[PDB]
Structure formats: C-alpha cells, structure tokens
mmCIF file of N, CA and C in Angstrom:
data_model
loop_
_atom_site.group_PDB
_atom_site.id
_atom_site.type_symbol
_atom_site.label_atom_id
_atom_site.label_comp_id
_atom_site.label_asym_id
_atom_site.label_seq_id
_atom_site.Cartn_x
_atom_site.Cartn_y
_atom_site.Cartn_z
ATOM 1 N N UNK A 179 -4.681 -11.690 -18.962
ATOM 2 C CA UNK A 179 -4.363 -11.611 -17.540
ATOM 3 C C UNK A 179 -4.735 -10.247 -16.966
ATOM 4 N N UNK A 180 -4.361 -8.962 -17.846
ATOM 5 C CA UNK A 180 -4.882 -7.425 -17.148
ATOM 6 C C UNK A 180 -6.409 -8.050 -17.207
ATOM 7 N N UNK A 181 -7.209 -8.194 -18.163
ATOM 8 C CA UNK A 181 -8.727 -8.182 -17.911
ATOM 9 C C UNK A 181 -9.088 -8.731 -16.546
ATOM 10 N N UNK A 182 -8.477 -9.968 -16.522
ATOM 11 C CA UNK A 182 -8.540 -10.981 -15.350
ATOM 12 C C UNK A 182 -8.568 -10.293 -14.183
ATOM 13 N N UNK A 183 -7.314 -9.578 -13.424
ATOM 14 C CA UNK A 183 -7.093 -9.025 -12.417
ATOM 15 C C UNK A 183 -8.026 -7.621 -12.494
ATOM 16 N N UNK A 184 -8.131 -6.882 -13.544
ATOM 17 C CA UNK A 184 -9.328 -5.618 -13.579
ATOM 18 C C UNK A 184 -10.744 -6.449 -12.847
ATOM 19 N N UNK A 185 -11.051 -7.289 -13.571
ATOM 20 C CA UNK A 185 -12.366 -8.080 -12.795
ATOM 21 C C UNK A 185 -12.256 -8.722 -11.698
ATOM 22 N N UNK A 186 -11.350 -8.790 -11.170
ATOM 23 C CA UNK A 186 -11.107 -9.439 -9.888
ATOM 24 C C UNK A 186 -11.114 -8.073 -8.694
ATOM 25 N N UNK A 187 -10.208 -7.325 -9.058
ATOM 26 C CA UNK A 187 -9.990 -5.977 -7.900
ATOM 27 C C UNK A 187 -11.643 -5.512 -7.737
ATOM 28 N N UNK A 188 -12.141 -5.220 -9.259
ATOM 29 C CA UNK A 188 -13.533 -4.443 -9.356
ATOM 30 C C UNK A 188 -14.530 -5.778 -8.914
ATOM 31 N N UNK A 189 -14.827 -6.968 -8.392
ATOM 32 C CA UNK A 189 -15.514 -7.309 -7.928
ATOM 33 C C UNK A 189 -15.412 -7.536 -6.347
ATOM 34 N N UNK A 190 -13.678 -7.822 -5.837
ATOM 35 C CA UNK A 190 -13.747 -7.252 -4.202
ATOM 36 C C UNK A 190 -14.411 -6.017 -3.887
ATOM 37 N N UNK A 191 -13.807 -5.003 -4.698
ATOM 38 C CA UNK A 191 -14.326 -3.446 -4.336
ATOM 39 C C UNK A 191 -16.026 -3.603 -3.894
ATOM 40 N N UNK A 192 -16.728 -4.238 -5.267
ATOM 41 C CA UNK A 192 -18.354 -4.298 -5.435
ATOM 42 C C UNK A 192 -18.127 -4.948 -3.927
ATOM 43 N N UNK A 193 -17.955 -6.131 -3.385
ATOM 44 C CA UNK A 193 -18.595 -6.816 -2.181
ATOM 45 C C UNK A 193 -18.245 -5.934 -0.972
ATOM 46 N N UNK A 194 -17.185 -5.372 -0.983
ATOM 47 C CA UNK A 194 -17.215 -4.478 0.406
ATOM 48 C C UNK A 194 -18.159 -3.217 -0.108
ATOM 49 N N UNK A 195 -18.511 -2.385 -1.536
ATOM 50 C CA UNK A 195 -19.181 -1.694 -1.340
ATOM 51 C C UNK A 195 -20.997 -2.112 -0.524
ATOM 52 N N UNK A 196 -20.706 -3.353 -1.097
ATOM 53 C CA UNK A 196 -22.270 -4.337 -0.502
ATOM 54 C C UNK A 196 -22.201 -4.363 1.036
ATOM 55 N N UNK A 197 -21.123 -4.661 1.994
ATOM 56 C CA UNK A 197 -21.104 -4.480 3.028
ATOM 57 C C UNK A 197 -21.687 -3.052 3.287
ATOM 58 N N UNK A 198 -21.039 -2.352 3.226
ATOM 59 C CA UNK A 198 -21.113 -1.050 3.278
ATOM 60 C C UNK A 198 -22.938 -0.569 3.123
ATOM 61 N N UNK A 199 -23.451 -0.950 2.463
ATOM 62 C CA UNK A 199 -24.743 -0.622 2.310
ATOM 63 C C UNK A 199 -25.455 -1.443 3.364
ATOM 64 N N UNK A 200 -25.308 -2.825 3.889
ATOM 65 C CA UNK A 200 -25.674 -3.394 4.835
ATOM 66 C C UNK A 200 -25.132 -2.515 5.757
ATOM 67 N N UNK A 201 -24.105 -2.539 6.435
ATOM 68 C CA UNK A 201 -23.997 -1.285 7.518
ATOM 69 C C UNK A 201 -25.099 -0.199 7.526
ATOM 70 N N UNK A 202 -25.018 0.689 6.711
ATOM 71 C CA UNK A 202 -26.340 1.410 6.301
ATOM 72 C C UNK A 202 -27.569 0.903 6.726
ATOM 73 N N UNK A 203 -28.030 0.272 6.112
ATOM 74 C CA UNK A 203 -28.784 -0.604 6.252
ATOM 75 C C UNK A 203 -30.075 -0.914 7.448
ATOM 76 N N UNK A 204 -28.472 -1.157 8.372
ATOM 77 C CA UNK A 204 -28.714 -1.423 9.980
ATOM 78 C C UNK A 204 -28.901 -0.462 10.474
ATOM 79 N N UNK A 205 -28.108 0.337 10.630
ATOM 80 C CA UNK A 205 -27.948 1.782 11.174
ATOM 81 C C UNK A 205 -29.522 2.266 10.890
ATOM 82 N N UNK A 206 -30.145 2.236 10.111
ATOM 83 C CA UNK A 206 -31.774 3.188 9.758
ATOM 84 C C UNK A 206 -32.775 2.235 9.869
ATOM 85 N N UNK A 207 -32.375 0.808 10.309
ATOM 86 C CA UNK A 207 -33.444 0.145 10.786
ATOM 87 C C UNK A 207 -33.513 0.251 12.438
ATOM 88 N N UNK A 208 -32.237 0.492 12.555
ATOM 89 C CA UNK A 208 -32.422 0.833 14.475
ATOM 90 C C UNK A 208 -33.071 2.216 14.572
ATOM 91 N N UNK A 209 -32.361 3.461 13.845
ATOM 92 C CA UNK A 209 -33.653 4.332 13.901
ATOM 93 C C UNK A 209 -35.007 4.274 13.633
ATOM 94 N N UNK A 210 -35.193 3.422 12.966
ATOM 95 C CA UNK A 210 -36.990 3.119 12.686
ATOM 96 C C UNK A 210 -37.655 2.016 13.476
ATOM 97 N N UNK A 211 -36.924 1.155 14.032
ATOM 98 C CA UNK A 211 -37.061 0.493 15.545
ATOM 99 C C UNK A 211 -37.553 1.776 16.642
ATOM 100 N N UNK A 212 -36.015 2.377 17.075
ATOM 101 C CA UNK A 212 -36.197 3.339 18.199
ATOM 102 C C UNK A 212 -37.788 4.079 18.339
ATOM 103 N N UNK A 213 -38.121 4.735 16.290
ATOM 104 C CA UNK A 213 -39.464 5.638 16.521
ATOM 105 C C UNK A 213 -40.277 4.694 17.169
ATOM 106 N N UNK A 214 -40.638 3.434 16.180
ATOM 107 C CA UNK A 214 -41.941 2.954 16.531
ATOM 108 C C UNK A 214 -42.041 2.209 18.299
ATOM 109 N N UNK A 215 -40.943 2.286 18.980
ATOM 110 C CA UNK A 215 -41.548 2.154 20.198
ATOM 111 C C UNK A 215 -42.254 3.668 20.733
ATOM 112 N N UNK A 216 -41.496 4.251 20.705
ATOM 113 C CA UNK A 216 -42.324 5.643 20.680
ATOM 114 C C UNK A 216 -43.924 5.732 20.063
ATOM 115 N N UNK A 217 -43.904 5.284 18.809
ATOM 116 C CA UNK A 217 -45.315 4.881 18.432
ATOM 117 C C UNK A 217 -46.090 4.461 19.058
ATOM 118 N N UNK A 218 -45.719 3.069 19.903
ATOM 119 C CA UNK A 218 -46.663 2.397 20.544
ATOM 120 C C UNK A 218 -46.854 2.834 21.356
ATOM 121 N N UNK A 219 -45.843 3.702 22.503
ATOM 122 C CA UNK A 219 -46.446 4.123 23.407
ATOM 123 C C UNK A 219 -47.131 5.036 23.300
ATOM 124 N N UNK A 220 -47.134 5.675 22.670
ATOM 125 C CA UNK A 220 -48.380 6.890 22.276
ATOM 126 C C UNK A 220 -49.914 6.118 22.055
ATOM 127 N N UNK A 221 -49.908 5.102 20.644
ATOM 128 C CA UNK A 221 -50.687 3.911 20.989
ATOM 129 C C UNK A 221 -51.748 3.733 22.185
ATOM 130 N N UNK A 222 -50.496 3.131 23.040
ATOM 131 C CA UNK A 222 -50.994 2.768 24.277
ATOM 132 C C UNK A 222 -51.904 4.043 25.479
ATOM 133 N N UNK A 223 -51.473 5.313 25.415
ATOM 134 C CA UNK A 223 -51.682 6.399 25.597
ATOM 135 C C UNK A 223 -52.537 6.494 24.944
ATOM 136 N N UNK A 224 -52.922 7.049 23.827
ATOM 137 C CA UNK A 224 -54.297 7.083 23.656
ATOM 138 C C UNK A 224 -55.351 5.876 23.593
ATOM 139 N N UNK A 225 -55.085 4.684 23.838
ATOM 140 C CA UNK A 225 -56.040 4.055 24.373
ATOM 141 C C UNK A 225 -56.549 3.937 25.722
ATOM 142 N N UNK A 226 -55.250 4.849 26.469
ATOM 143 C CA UNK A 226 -55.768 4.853 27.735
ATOM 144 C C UNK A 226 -56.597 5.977 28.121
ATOM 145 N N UNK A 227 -56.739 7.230 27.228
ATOM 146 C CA UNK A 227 -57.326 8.499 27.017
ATOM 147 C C UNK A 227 -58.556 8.710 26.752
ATOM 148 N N UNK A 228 -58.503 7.567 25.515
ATOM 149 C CA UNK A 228 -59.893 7.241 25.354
ATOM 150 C C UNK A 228 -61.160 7.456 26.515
ATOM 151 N N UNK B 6 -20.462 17.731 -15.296
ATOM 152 C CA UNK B 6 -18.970 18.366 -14.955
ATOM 153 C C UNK B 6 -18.449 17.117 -14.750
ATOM 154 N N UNK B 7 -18.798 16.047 -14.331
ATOM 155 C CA UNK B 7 -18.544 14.527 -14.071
ATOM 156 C C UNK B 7 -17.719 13.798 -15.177
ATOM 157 N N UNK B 8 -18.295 12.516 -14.663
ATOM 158 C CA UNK B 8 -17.449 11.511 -15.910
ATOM 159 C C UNK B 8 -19.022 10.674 -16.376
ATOM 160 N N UNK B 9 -19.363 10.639 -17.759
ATOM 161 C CA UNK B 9 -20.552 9.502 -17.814
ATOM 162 C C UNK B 9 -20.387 8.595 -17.539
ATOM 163 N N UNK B 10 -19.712 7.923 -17.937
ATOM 164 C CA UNK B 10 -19.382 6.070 -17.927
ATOM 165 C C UNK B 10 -17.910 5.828 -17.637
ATOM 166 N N UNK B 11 -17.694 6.165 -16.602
ATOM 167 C CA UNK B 11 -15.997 6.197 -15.800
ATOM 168 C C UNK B 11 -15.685 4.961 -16.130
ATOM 169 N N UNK B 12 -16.401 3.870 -15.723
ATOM 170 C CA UNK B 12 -15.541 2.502 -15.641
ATOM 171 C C UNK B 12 -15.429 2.079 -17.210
ATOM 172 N N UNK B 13 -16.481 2.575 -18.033
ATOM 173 C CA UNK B 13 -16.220 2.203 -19.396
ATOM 174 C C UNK B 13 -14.963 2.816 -20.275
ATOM 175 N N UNK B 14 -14.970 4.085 -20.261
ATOM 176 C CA UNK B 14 -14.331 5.187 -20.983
ATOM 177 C C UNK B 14 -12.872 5.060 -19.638
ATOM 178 N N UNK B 15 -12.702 4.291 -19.083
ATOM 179 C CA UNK B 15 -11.499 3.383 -18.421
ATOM 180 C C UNK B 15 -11.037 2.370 -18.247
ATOM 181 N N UNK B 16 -11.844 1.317 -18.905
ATOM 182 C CA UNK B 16 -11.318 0.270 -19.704
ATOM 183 C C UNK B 16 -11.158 0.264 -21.061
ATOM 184 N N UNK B 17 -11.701 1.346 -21.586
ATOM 185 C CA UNK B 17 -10.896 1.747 -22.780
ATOM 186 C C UNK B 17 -9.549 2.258 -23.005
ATOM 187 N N UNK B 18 -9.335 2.929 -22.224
ATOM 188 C CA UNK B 18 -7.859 3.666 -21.985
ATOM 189 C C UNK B 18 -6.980 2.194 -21.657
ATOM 190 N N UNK B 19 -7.386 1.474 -20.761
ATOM 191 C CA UNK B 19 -6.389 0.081 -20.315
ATOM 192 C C UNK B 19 -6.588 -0.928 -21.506
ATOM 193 N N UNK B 20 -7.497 -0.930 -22.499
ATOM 194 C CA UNK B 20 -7.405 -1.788 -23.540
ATOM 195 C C UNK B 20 -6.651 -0.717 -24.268
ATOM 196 N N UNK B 21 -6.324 0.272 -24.837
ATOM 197 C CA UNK B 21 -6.098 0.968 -26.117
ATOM 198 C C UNK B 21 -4.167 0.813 -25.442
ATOM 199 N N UNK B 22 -3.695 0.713 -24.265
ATOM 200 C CA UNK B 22 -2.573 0.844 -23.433
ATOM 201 C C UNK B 22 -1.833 -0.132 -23.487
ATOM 202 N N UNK B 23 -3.261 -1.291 -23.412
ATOM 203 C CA UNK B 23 -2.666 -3.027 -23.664
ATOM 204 C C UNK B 23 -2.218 -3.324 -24.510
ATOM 205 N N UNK B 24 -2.805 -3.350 -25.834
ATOM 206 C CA UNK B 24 -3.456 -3.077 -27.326
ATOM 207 C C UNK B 24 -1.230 -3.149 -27.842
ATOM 208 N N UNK B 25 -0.995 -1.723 -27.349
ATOM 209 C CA UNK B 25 0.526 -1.171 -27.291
ATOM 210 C C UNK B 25 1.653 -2.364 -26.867
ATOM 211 N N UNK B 26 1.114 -2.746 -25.812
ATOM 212 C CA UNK B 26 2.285 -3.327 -25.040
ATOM 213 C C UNK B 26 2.507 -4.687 -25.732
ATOM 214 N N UNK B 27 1.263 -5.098 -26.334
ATOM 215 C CA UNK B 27 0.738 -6.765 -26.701
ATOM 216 C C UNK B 27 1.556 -6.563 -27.922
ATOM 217 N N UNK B 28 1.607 -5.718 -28.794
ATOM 218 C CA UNK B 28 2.058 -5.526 -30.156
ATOM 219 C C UNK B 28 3.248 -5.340 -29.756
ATOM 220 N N UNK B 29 3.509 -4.783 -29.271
ATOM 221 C CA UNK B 29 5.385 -4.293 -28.955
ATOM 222 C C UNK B 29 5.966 -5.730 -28.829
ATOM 223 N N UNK B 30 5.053 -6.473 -27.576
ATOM 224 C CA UNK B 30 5.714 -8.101 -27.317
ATOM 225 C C UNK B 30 6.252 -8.837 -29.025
ATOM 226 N N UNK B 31 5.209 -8.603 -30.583
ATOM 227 C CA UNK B 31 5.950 -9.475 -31.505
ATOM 228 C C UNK B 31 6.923 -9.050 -31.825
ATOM 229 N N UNK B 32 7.223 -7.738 -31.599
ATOM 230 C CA UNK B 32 8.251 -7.317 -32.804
ATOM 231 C C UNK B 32 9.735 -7.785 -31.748
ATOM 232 N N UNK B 33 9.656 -7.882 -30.164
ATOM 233 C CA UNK B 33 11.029 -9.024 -29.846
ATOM 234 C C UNK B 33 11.310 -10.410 -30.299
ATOM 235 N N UNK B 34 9.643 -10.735 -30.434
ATOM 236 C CA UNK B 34 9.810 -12.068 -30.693
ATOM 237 C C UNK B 34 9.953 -12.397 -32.459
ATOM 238 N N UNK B 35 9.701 -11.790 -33.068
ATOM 239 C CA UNK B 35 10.379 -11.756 -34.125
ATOM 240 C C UNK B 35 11.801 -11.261 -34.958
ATOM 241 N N UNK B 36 12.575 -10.562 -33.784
ATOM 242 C CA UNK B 36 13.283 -9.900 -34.139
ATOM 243 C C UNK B 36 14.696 -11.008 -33.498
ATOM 244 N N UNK B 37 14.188 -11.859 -32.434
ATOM 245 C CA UNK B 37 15.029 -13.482 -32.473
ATOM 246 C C UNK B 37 14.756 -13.868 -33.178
ATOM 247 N N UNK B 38 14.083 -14.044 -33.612
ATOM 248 C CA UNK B 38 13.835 -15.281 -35.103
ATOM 249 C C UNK B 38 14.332 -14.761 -36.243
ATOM 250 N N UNK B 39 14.707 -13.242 -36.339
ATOM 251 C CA UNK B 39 15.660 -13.176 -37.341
ATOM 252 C C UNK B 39 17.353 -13.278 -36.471
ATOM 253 N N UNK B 40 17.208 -12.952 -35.288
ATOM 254 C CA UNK B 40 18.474 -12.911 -34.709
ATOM 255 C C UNK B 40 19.223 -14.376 -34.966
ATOM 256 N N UNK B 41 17.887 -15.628 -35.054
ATOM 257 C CA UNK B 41 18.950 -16.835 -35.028
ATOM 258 C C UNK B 41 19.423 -17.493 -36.517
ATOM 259 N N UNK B 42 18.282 -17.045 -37.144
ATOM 260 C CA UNK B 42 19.068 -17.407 -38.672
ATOM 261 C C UNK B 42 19.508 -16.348 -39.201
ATOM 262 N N UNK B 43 19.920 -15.128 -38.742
ATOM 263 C CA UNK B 43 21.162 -14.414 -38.948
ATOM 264 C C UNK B 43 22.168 -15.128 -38.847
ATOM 265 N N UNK B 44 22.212 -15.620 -37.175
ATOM 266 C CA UNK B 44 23.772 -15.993 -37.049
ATOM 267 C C UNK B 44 24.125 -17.329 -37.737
ATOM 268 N N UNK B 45 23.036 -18.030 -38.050
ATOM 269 C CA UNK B 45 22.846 -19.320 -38.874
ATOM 270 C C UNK B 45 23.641 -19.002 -40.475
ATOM 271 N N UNK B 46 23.215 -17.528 -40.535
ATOM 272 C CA UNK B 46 23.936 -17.260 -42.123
ATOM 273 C C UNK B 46 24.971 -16.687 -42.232
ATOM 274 N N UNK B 47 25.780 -15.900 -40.920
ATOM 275 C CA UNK B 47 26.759 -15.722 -40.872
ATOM 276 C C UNK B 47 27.697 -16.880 -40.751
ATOM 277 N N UNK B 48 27.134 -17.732 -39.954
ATOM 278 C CA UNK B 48 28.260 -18.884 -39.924
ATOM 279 C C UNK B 48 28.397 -19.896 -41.281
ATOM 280 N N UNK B 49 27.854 -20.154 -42.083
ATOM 281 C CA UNK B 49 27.190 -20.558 -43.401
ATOM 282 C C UNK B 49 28.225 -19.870 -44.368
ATOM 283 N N UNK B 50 28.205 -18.715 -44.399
ATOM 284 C CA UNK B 50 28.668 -17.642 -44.885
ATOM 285 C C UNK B 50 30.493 -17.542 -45.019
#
C-alpha cells in the first residue's frame, strides 16, 4: 500500500509538472509569433525597397 | 553539492523504514498466538 500511494502522489506531481511545461511552452511560442510578424514586415519592406 | 538520484536513494530510506514497521507487525501477531494458548494452558493447568 506505501509503494502504491508513493506512485500515485509521484505521478500527479509528474502531470502537473507536464502542465507546467505546456504553460512554458505557450508563453515562447507567443514570443516567437510576436518576432516573426516583425519579420515579415521587414520582408515586406524590403521588397518594397527593392 | 546536490543529491544524485534523490528519488532513488529516497525510496530506499521508505523501503529500509517499511522493511521495520512490516517486521515489527509479526512479532504482535505472534505474540497472540502465544497469548491464546497460554491462557488455553493456564486453564488446562
């Protein structure tokens, strides 16, 4: 029964640590969203420079 | 300065802890089983 409940607590813990990295996750895909519009418009800018 | 293998070298400590408690459990349960044919031989007696 201790083994039982040790593997039980330590596999909730693991799935919210998994949340937790999805949060992450998100968070540095919206910063790498935000650059590449910036990208494009530069992009677009130098094709208009051209 | 850490721990190498925390979760290992801590389920060792909770098995070596268990290990204690699990063994302690026969010696009540054997120590009725002399408690009842004690009184089995006192009354006999």
């Amino acid at each position: 029964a201790n083994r039982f409940t040790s593997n039980i607590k330590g596999l909730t813990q693991a799935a919210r640590n998994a949340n937790d990295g999805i949060s992450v996750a998100q968070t540095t895909e919206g910063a790498l969203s935000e650059i590449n519009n910036n990208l494009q418009r530069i992009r677009e800018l130098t094709v208009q420079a051209s | 300065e850490s721990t190498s293998d925390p979760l290992a070298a801590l389920d060792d400590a909770i098995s070596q802890i268990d290990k204690f408690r699990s063994s302690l459990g026969a010696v009540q349960n054997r120590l009725d089983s002399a408690v009842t044919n004690l009184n089995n031989t006192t009354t006999n007696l």
